[PDB]
Amino acid sequence: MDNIIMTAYISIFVQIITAIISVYGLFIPLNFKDIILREILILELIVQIIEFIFYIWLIITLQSINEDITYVRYFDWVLTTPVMLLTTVYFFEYMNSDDGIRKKEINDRDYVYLFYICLSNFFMLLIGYLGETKQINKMLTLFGGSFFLFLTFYLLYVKYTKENWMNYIVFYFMFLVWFLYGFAFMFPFSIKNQMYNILDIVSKNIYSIFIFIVILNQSYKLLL
Ligand SMILES: CCCCCC/C=C\CCCCCCCC(=O)OC[C@@H](O)CO
Ligand SMILES: *C/C=C(C)/C=C/C=C(C)/C=C/C1=C(C)CCCC1(C)C
Ligand SMILES: CCCCCCCCCCCCCCCCCCCC
Ligand code: NA
Numbered sequence: 140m141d142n143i144i145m146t147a148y149i150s151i152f153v154q155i156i157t158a159i160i161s162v163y164g165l166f167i168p169l170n171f172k173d174i175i176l177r178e179i180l181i182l183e184l185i186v187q188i189i190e191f192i193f194y195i196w197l198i199i200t201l202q203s204i205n206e207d208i209t210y211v212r213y214f215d216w217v218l219t220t221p222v223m224l225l226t227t228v229y230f231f232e233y234m235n236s237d238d239g240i241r242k243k244e245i246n247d248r249d250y251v252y253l254f255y256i257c258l259s260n261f262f263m264l265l266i267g268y269l270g271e272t273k274q275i276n277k278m279l280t281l282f283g284g285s286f287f288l289f290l291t292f293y294l295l296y297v298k299y300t301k302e303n304w305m306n307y308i309v310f311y312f313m314f315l316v317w318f319l320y321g322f323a324f325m326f327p328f329s330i331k332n333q334m335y336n337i338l339d340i341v342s343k344n345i346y347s348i349f350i351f352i353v354i355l356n357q358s359y360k361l362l363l
Contacts, residue, residue: 140201146336151195153344154340157347158184158187167358173233179233180347180350186219193214225242234305316338319338
């Protein structure tokens with residue numbers, strides 16, 4: 140119980156500071172080519188609203204835990220993970236497009252493919268939820284959930300990446316971190332929840348901080 144709470148507080152600490160940083164980031168002036176970074180940052184903040192509601196619910200609920208509450212995380216994930224996949228797509232498009240590109244152009248062009256990515260991701264989550272609530276066994280959950288994780292990341296890779304180390308860093312870091320949520324699923328209640336509390340810092344807050352630093356680097360001359 141104590142370590143779940145402690146890791147929850149660590150996660151909340153990083154969430155609060157990341158939210159402050161992100162809000163300031165929204166007001167950094169941007170060159171034309173960089174406008175999509177602010178569109179990404181807005182969406183990451185929206186993800187943070189959901190995440191924070193979950194964490195406040197969690198620390199209140201852990202005072203009197205009587206059931207395995209791990210499944211409640213899926214009510215966050217089903218909202219936040221599709222947004223995070225979209226923002227990832229936007230960032231790859233930003234890195235890889237020779238000319239300035241915005242989210243409306245991407246959405247209007249690729250909505251069908253983006254739906255495929257989010258549908259694959261939804262099946263991953265649904266299988267996980269069935270496993271977390273013990274409606275299917277753990278082995279089926281891991282193999283089915285991992286199948287859809289792979290499919291999601293494959294769809295992302297083949298449409299939106301380029302073959303260079305910048306792309307490999309962003310793609311593989313993310314893929315590994317998301318895979319580690321499946322790794323966490325295997326562990327008992329306390330360890331599993333500690334792992335999710337800390338993985339959220341990496342999958343969400345570190346991404347926001349990254350986008351903020353990219354914004355600051357691109358725009359520092361407009362600031363100074
Ligand atoms: C235009 C600059 C791009 C430079 C790209 C590579 C350079 C430096 C490393 C940046 C920090 C690591 C990558 C953060 C973005 C990322 O993968 O987050 C995924 C994470 O949340 C977990 O899922
Ligand atoms: C902010 C929260 C995030 C990014 C949550 C991510 C969750 C996953 C990538 C879940 C993965 C799973 C597997 C790969 C296998 C089946 C069980 C899951 C759902 C935990
Ligand atoms: C002992 C049980 C409770 C442990 C609480 C403390 C756990 C802290 C683990 C690290 C937290 C920060 C994670 C940062 C990201 C990991 C590496 C990222 C590389 C880019
Ligand atoms: Na459970």
